[PDB]
């Protein structure tokens, strides 16, 4: 044929939901043969006309995406290619919000989506602090500073150097330097050690908010533009509790598998077991309510204020999920 396979058709039908919060990302992972990041990135690049805008050869895009997807670990429960695909797709929906219409350049949009795609690549499924405490090679290479996030960037960029992988080959040096700086600034902002300063800056921006040509945010300097993109990808990274409950609970199962495996490695080595990593002293439900109350709701309430009323349904889902987890605590 020159026509898709029946499995390719069922996948194409699921990918019609790519512009919606609550995409069936686990179903896309199954239908694509464990290629959700490649098919979601390819769909988004075609939808936003990024191949034409950036003169990206389609074979180069697909080669890079498969290579990037292959550097995520299928034997890590949470920080895998499905999480990367989910953050990409969630960023893509946030970039389309009414309040940001015509705000960002094509290069800023490419930076946010590419950053989302690479932001956890080659994640070993243990925390920065675990890597530091174990004298791991990664912690030594990055001098204990944003160890994982430095690594994700270095890998994401180094893979551009593999055979037919340079998706930026037709960008000018000016475009490449601007893109690279923005991608670095965004992925380094995914380190949870930066969360309280990012949130403080987002709150300051909401308090001093300006809108222009009616209803659209005014961002007239790099500091403000990069801060919104950093907070946007950080919101996407912390989006699991804002999703329909069938999706959220799969994310909770996966993060707790990864945390409990780290806690097993800590216990067996005589280390202090990290917060929420002890399967013998766990409350999954209390931990989700704490996560929402102290991290996810303060961030998403502030994001919702910046883009008000655009994120009202996302904030309502978060509040409903929080009440659901609270109601299951013995
Ligand atoms: C779908 O689910 C989760 C997805 C991801 C995480 C993460 N978590 N983090 C780190 C976040 C910071 C806390 C440590 C964990 C690591 C990541 O790097 C990431 C990987 C972002 C976690 C998910 O949920 C698992 C429950 C954690 C409970 O998080 C909290 C926080 C705060 C208080 C609190 N404060 N004051 N009083 N209580 C209680 C509980
Ligand atoms: Mg592995
Ligand atoms: Mg990360
Ligand atoms: Zn992540």
């Amino acid at each position: 044929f020159g026509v898709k396979t029946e499995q390719e058709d069922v996948l194409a039908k699921e990918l019609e939901d790519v512009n919606k919060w609550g995409l069936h990302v686990f179903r896309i992972a199954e239908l694509s043969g464990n290629r959700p990041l490649t098919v979601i990135m390819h769909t988004i690049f075609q939808e936003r006309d990024l191949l034409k805008t950036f003169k990206i050869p389609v074979d180069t895009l697909i080669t890079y995406l498969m290579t990037l997807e292959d550097h995520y670990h299928a034997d890590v429960a949470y920080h895998n290619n499905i999480h990367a695909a989910d953050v990409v797709q969630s960023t893509h929906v946030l970039l389309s919000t009414p309040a940001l219409e015509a705000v960002f350049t094509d290069l800023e949009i490419l930076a946010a989506i590419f950053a989302s795609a690479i932001h956890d690549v080659d994640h070993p499924g243990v925390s920065n602090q675990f890597l530091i405490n174990t004298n791991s090679e990664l912690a030594l290479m990055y001098n204990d500073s944003s160890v994982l996030e430095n690594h994700h960037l270095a890998v994401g960029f180094k893979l551009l150097q593999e055979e037919n992988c340079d998706i930026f080959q037709n960008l000018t040096k000016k475009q490449r330097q601007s893109l690279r700086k923005m991608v670095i600034d965004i992925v380094l902002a995914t380190d949870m050690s930066k969360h309280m300063n990012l949130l403080a800056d987002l709150k300051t921006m909401v308090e001093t908010k300006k809108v222009t040509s009616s209803g659209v945010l005014l961002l007239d300097n790099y500091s403000d533009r990069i801060q919104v993109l950093q907070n946007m990808v950080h919101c996407a990274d912390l989006s699991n509790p804002t999703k329909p409950l069938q999706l959220y609970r799969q994310w909770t199962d996966r993060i707790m598998e990864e945390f409990f495996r780290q806690g097993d490695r800590e216990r067996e080595r005589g280390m202090e077991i990290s917060p929420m990593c002890d399967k013998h002293n766990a409350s999954v439900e209390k931990s989700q309510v704490g996560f929402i109350d102290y991290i996810v709701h303060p961030l998403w309430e502030t994001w919702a204020d910046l883009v008000h009323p655009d994120a009202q349904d996302i904030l309502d889902t978060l509040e409903d999920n929080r009440e659901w987890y609270q109601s299951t605590i013995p």
Side-chain angles (χ1 to χ4, degrees):
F1 29 35
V3 177
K4 321 209 228 313
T5 59
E6 276 328 283
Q7 192 175 344
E8 291 183 319
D9 183 61
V10 176
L11 172 62
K13 287 174 167 53
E14 289 288 346
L15 286 166
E16 285 172 6
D17 282 345
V18 72
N19 305 326
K20 299 197 184 128
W21 209 247
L23 175 71
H24 301 323
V25 66
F26 294 102
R27 183 69 169 144
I28 284 163
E30 287 174 341
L31 287 172
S32 65
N34 204 22
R35 290 295 198 228
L37 179 61
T38 298
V39 305
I40 287 167
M41 283 283 280
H42 188 203
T43 302
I44 288 162
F45 272 55
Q46 290 289 1
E47 171 88 349
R48 291 184 172 279
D49 208 19
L50 291 172
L51 292 96
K52 284 207 184 154
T53 299
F54 290 110
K55 298 296 180 289
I56 309 177
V58 65
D59 53 311
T60 310
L61 181 61
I62 296 168
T63 304
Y64 177 77
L65 292 173
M66 324 216 77
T67 303
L68 179 63
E69 187 140 37
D70 284 341
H71 282 74
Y72 275 89
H73 297 255
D75 60 343
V76 165
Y78 184 94
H79 288 106
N80 57 50
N81 54 318
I82 314 174
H83 170 66
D86 177 46
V87 174
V88 165
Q89 187 264 338
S90 302
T91 294
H92 165 70
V93 174
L94 295 175
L95 277 168
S96 297
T97 205
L100 296 178
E101 178 174 329
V103 166
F104 292 114
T105 68
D106 290 321
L107 193 67
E108 289 161 338
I109 289 166
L110 178 65
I113 294 168
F114 181 76
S116 293
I118 69 166
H119 87 281
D120 277 332
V121 64
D122 202 33
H123 199 295
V126 292
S127 70
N128 282 327
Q129 194 64 54
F130 183 81
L131 292 172
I132 293 162
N133 288 355
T134 59
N135 197 58
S136 71
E137 184 178 8
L138 280 181
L140 296 187
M141 185 183 329
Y142 288 118
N143 301 298
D144 304 344
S145 175
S146 291
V147 167
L148 284 161
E149 298 75 20
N150 272 298
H151 185 57
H152 306 315
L153 280 164
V155 171
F157 283 117
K158 153 212 97 114
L159 289 180
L160 290 165
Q161 298 148 357
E162 292 198 4
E163 181 67 30
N164 198 25
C165 286
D166 187 8
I167 62 168
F168 306 126
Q169 60 191 73
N170 289 320
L171 273 61
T172 67
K173 181 58 162 181
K174 278 194 191 292
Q175 290 180 296
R176 294 183 277 114
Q177 286 203 303
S178 173
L179 175 64
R180 172 165 171 83
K181 181 173 194 69
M182 290 190 284
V183 167
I184 294 167
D185 285 348
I186 295 169
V187 176
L188 287 182
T190 65
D191 178 353
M192 278 299 308
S193 80
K194 297 313 208 311
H195 166 78
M196 289 304 175
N197 297 333
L198 273 180
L199 182 52
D201 287 354
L202 185 64
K203 286 173 173 313
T204 297
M205 172 168 305
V206 166
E207 284 163 9
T208 63
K209 174 167 166 188
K210 312 187 190 316
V211 299
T212 307
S213 255
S214 282
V216 156
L217 291 174
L218 174 53
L219 301 175
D220 60 19
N221 59 94
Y222 181 74
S223 276
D224 287 342
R225 297 179 79 82
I226 198 59
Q227 269 171 12
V228 170
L229 293 171
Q230 286 169 320
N231 274 292
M232 181 188 298
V233 172
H234 182 55
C235 285
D237 204 21
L238 289 186
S239 65
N240 300 335
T242 79
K243 293 302 168 69
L245 189 63
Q246 172 154 10
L247 285 170
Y248 175 24
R249 290 184 63 184
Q250 291 185 72
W251 293 122
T252 301
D253 287 351
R254 282 168 179 276
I255 196 67
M256 291 318 297
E257 177 174 340
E258 192 168 305
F259 281 7
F260 289 159
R261 288 180 94 278
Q262 172 171 326
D264 292 349
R265 288 180 263 182
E266 290 166 335
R267 185 166 46 253
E268 69 200 344
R269 301 156 84 104
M271 283 165 70
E272 193 165 289
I273 300 178
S274 291
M276 303 169 281
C277 291
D278 189 353
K279 61 181 180 196
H280 297 125
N281 295 348
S283 179
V284 172
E285 299 83 13
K286 277 183 218 201
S287 288
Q288 282 309 310
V289 174
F291 187 44
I292 298 173
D293 287 347
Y294 290 104
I295 299 168
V296 177
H297 190 279
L299 175 60
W300 274 98
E301 179 164 46
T302 311
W303 182 264
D305 278 359
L306 186 72
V307 301
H308 179 86
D310 293 9
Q312 190 59 49
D313 294 333
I314 295 169
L315 198 61
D316 289 345
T317 306
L318 179 56
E319 289 171 0
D320 287 350
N321 289 343
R322 190 261 181 208
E323 284 312 297
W324 185 88
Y325 267 107
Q326 181 62 31
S327 82
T328 68
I329 297 166

